[PDB]
Design an enzyme around this catalytic site. Structure first.
Site, PDB file in Angstrom:
ATOM      1  CE1 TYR B  93     -19.438 122.392  91.350  1.00  0.00           C
ATOM      2  CE2 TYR B  93     -18.862 123.705  93.231  1.00  0.00           C
ATOM      3  CZ  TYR B  93     -18.781 123.481  91.874  1.00  0.00           C
ATOM      4  OH  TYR B  93     -18.060 124.284  91.027  1.00  0.00           O
ATOM      5  CG  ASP B 155     -17.821 134.624  95.291  1.00  0.00           C
ATOM      6  OD1 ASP B 155     -17.378 135.736  95.685  1.00  0.00           O
ATOM      7  OD2 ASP B 155     -17.388 134.227  94.197  1.00  0.00           O
ATOM      8  CG  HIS B 407     -27.098 127.406  91.991  1.00  0.00           C
ATOM      9  ND1 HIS B 407     -27.673 127.765  93.181  1.00  0.00           N
ATOM     10  CD2 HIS B 407     -25.798 127.150  92.270  1.00  0.00           C
ATOM     11  CE1 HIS B 407     -26.771 127.704  94.139  1.00  0.00           C
ATOM     12  NE2 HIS B 407     -25.618 127.347  93.607  1.00  0.00           N
ATOM     13  CE1 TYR B 488     -14.317 124.552  90.725  1.00  0.00           C
ATOM     14  CE2 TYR B 488     -12.322 124.319  92.027  1.00  0.00           C
ATOM     15  CZ  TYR B 488     -13.605 124.793  91.866  1.00  0.00           C
ATOM     16  OH  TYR B 488     -14.178 125.524  92.879  1.00  0.00           O
ATOM     17  NE  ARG B 489     -16.783 121.501  94.859  1.00  0.00           N
ATOM     18  CZ  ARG B 489     -16.845 122.247  95.975  1.00  0.00           C
ATOM     19  NH1 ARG B 489     -16.140 123.373  96.124  1.00  0.00           N
ATOM     20  NH2 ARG B 489     -17.629 121.824  96.952  1.00  0.00           N
TER      21      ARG B 489
END
EC number: 1.1.3.38
Lengths: 545, 545, 545
Positions: B93, B155, B407, B488-489
């Site tokens: 993110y 996680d 990632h 959603y993000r």
């Protein structure tokens, strides 16, 4: 029409008639009333304050969402404040009365009625302001959805499914926290512009059959009522108990039939059993042994449901401790009364139920009853329907405690601790006596909080007692704040006081609210004053109470 | 310090050195970095875009809340944009990187660390931005609260409890919905003013021992962390995934040890077993048979945890359908893999567990396993700790799928319908192969929705592939919108694209959002551009991507 | 000088050093202090709140009125707030400390000293801020005006004649109401402009010998110090206890030796004799039998003057009812103690004095004493000088009640009714014991009111007690308001609380006050926050306590 009793601030009578002629020309004479079961929408029905207070100039009933935007336009044009209501049956919070007289009460329920959608795979419904709880129930039954999907109703079912939800009302099923069960909301902001929230913002992909439809009538994307957050800032809550938008449509989640239902009643014999009871409920609520929102009622609440006060006594002053015990016996109830229920397959109900009973058996003289075990007229038999989503008209009977009764709810929140619950009970019970009023109330169990609805009832035609009632209420707010508890909701007249309660760091929270309001409502035409939030053209000096 | 690599928009070097001297004079030189396990806070680590992009000018660690206000003041004085972070461990993110280069990364985590409160009766904790998940765990154990109160972790346990919660992160216990478990939040708005929400606005009654304390250090009222709403507009969500304020403190509800816990693994043999599995999950999730947030993982996710890609193949291109099957066998897993857990007394676990197995048994070759029944290195043994609130470092192994892997998460939401689940999977899998990337992913089961985290992993030093990765992402967004599914993000660069996705009724949601932003942040110094929302001094032309 | 401890709001260090250089260039380095008997002017000496609070950045001593205008100009240029003081000897009201740290303490006293005029025909004096009470006395004696003209002093003679007068201080001769005895005031408003009020606006006719003099140095017209009103709006009081201007000069009326003076002491034996005594005082005060402002002191006040607390007891907690009785005996005093005085020709003193004794004789064990009749160290011998305009250093002894004592005044007003006097005493005495503080106090008799100075004394190095002292104060304010009694004056930290007390009709008085403040002080550089009144650039959120 012509000459209203009260004109909205700064507006000439000529302006007023120009406006009304315009709205009449939009929605028809049959939907615009001028002020020169069937709830009134023109004035506060639970009279507490004097006249001139909270009196609309005209009630207008939009035929649809277009109509609401035309009407917002006109309010911006003429600077005519609006007072948007869905149903307005909650006398107690002032019903449909506007906070600032002169306002135009916007009855969104009369024509904007539809049960828009009832989705079984997603277990949700999409509703307009007019959809009462009875309506959504009748909708479910005539489509055989009653055995697949269940509602979640407030003590009375004539209220608005969306009006109550945006007001953050509570219910008694596992889906009792209504506002937390919304997803997908459509709003008419103050500029006129339509807005849908969360994934309501992600638009249904174009397809032949939905082309050309006005925004208001467009379908919503798939996840619109399954996920509330959308993306970015989650603005939904600005529209709860606020004057930031006109809520026109909302998605509410529905509970799928659990395939198992048992409702019960546990009676607590002494008035001080409330302390041990609440200490007991705590771990069982937080630990999911206590499925729904359980209620702890005071004996006069159930007493009231069954009879007026002359039917239990001749005394005009407040019933005593002795008399309360006596009423308890008479009704086979406790002094305090716990109502709850079990949901799901019998093997699981059974373990929960042994746990519950086990816990509550440390209270001397405790007595467990299911519906069958109690009289035909009993509250449990009525509340057995309430905890399964079935709405009723029964529990309204208590409003008539006194002859020309009206009521107001003093609603603080209290931890789920007996110590604390008893403390707040004390506080409220003293004042109530000081005012010469029977204390009457319930604690509704939240997972870590307890909503405490004190039902102040009184004589709406008695000058002296209404004044007593005003003193009570304002004294209770202070008292309660002095003990660090605030109210979650109130009537028009206590809004300011109550918002003044939340003044941490010099009123930071209301300051920041007043910006958001002015930014989005430069003419301040949407419900000036709701929850103590006032747009800049409304001097605080002139308006706050 | 002197000469930064990138100066924030319109600011002279002189101005910049003036400001830094001022901040060094407030928080000490050991806290204010100038850019001329241990996460970087200066730049996007999962490089995807080119350089010049998302590069801070200086990182500044406030000692406390005062320090954040002083800094806000200086940002409003000099018009320097700030990028407030908590931890910034979520590469994927974009981690700590600021959206507009030249920004001042505000590392709140480094000094604003405290577990302020762990309340057992009310079952809540109050935390500062620095409190990671491992931190709140270690706090619990050193106070023996481990067998009374339980956490809810994502996680990876190295993230911030409040950072993740305001970002709307999800977990794997019954309290997985993190942002829905907060109540009490303290904010430093852009004007500098402190604001605490809901019942955090109702102030703790004066008492001798708390007098003269700064607002920042005052205790909170009793219902502050037990009831989220307060009274009036519930503004809380304006601070989720937005640039409306700097979050300093937040109350998060904790789960009371349930006295019973069983975690399990159901393996689905074929790649098309996802459709029946998701139809199976639907009713059990809605009917509360499925207690926590269960997860459906794709074989390479678990594969990844256990080993890099060279450890399963030499192939540089994406592994084939046959190869995936082979890997499944090798690991004793399915093609898809459901992970869940049972909470509570054994009698109830047992009925739920018979229900679950029963349903899933309608999938050929389905195999059910508890932790014990699987290898020592197995994911189930790792996730058995995750579903009970115990945080770990394990699952990070998969970021190394490829050598210099970085990632990014492509996160759509999808109904809890197999039909839909497969549809979205399809779409995502095509594109991933078109980019020559192994599809790797999970669906995390929401009550009526399913968050679908596609893990795009690639070579951060490969120009060609990163471009491929940028094509993939942007094409997946459009694809996904085409089929009515939003994300959603996202990461810094897809923020704009993603909000543009939410354009119902001509971008109403974003317009209305820009209004609130500008009102409360006229100088626009709070994170311009987060979530696609830009203050008016930042031309869209010049800044959106 | 360079680096201050606290910079005024929004000001850079550069700006600050620019300004200081400018002021050093105006008034000389010997007058402008930078913070990196002899009262402190940099901080609150009666520490109560914590540090960072009320801390000036630099103290600046103007040589004259020009210098005050130059400084005003520079404050408007740089937006630097000023805190003008005269003397700043009143620890208890926070002395010289500024309300908002970073301020520039403007010490007007150090150079603006002159007794400008002592007019015998008109019986007035015109004074600058520096002129203490001892100063105007020494001026009188060195010009032999001592047997013609008499002063009016407050319990301590080291205060400023004009500072005390604009702050509405009270004295113990017939001219005790100080602010009611001024006529002629010269002000430097925030715009820089000089303004003299009432007949001070009617200018002295030109004449050869006063030509070319600066406005500041011009003489005044004849009726300037004989009639206060002028013509039109009588603006004078806008400069009392306010931040509306910097007071430079003021005319104070003096009392013409009355040709007869007798001071006396009436002791009241019991602690409940206060009620009859105050009913007795009522009619005699209104009927002018009671010439000056008489005082009713509590035993520890006089006790205190004579000795510290260890000198009467070992007890660390508050002395008991019995102990107080014992102390009374030891000193030959009452529990309560009335001090007054007779002015004028003997024939008239005599009739008044028979009247007074007569009335007070209805109090059992009452004992009347003149100075001669009491010990050499007695308070009466000290106050015999006080009621005749002779200032002293004596009465300060009581500040040392406790070792590292500091003190604060809690000042309510109370009717001149025993009923009320006792009620307020009660309230104050509870709280004081709840804080574990000896109640110490006086009522000073107003014609129709009674100023009640509660002297809270405590240990300035005791965190625990100071907090106790802060609780006490704030709780007394609320208590007092609850019973409809406001404070007439307070210390920096209670300013806000105290004005909030005056909120009739939704804070009308303060709103209207903010209007006048902003109009005349758009940059708001004059003492932001004095008396609770804040210019618009000082967020309430950020600054009120």
């Amino acid at each position: 029409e012509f000459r209203p009793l009260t004109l909205p601030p700064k507006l000439s009578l000529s302006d007023f008639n120009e406006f009304i002629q315009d709205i009449i020309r939009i929605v028809g004479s049959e939907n615009v009333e001028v002020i020169s079961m069937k709830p009134t929408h023109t004035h506060d029905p639970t009279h507490v304050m004097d006249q001139d207070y909270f009196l609309a100039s005209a009630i207008v009933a939009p035929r649809n969402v277009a109509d609401v935007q035309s009407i917002v336009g006109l309010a911006n044009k003429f600077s005519f404040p609006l007072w948007p209501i869905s149903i307005g049956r909650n006398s107690g919070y002032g019903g449909a009365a506007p906070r600032v007289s002169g306002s135009v009460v916007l009855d969104m329920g009369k024509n904007m009625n539809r049960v828009l959608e009832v989705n079984v795979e997603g277990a949700y419904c999409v509703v307009e302001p007019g959809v009462t709880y009875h309506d959504l129930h009748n909708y479910l039954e005539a489509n055989n959805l009653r055995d697949k999907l269940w509602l979640d109703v407030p003590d009375l079912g004539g209220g608005s499914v969306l009006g109550n939800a945006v007001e953050r009302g509570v219910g008694y099923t596992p889906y009792g926290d209504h506002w937390m069960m919304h997803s997908g909301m459509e709003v008419v902001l103050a500029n006129g512009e339509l807005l849908r929230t969360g994934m309501g913002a992600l638009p249904d992909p174009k397809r032949p059959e939905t082309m050309g439809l006005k925004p208001e009538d467009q379908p919503w994307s798939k996840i619109a009522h399954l996920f509330p957050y959308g993306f970015g800032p989650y603005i939904d809550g600005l529209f709860s108990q606020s004057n930031m938008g006109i809520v026109t449509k909302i998605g509410i989640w529905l509970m799928p039939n659990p395939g198992g239902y048992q409702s019960y009643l546990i009676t607590l014999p002494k008035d001080g059993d409330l302390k041990q009871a609440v200490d007991i409920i705590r771990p069982l609520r937080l630990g999911m042994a206590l499925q729904n929102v359980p209620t702890i009622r005071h004996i006069l609440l159930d007493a009231a449901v069954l009879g007026d006060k002359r039917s239990y006594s001749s005394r005009t002053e407040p019933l005593s401790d002795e008399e309360l015990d006596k009423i308890a016996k008479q009704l086979n109830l406790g002094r305090w009364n716990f109502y709850g229920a079990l949901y799901g397959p019998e093997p699981i109900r059974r373990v929960l139920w042994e746990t519950i009973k086990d816990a509550f058996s440390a209270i001397p003289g405790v007595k467990f009853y299911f519906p069958e075990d109690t009289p035909e007229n009993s509250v449990l038999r009525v509340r057995d329907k309430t905890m399964q989503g079935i709405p009723t008209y029964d529990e309204l009977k208590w409003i008539d405690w006194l002859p020309n009764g009206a009521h107001l709810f003093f609603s603080p929140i209290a931890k789920v601790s007996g110590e604390d619950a008893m403390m707040q009970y004390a506080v409220t019970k003293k004042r109530c006596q000081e005012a010469g009023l029977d204390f009457i109330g319930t604690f509704t169990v939240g997972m870590r909080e307890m909503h405490h609805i004190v039902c102040i009832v009184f004589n709406k035609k008695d000058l002296i007692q209404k004044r007593k009632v005003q003193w009570l209420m304002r004294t209770l707010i202070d008292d309660c704040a002095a003990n660090g508890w605030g109210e979650y909701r109130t009537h028009l007249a206590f809004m300011d006081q109550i918002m003044e309660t939340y003044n941490w760091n010099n009123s930071s929270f209301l300051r920041f609210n007043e910006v958001l309001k002015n930014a989005v409502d430069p003419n301040g035409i949407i419900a000036p004053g709701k929850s103590g939030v006032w747009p800049s053209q409304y001097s605080h000096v002139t308006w706050k109470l």
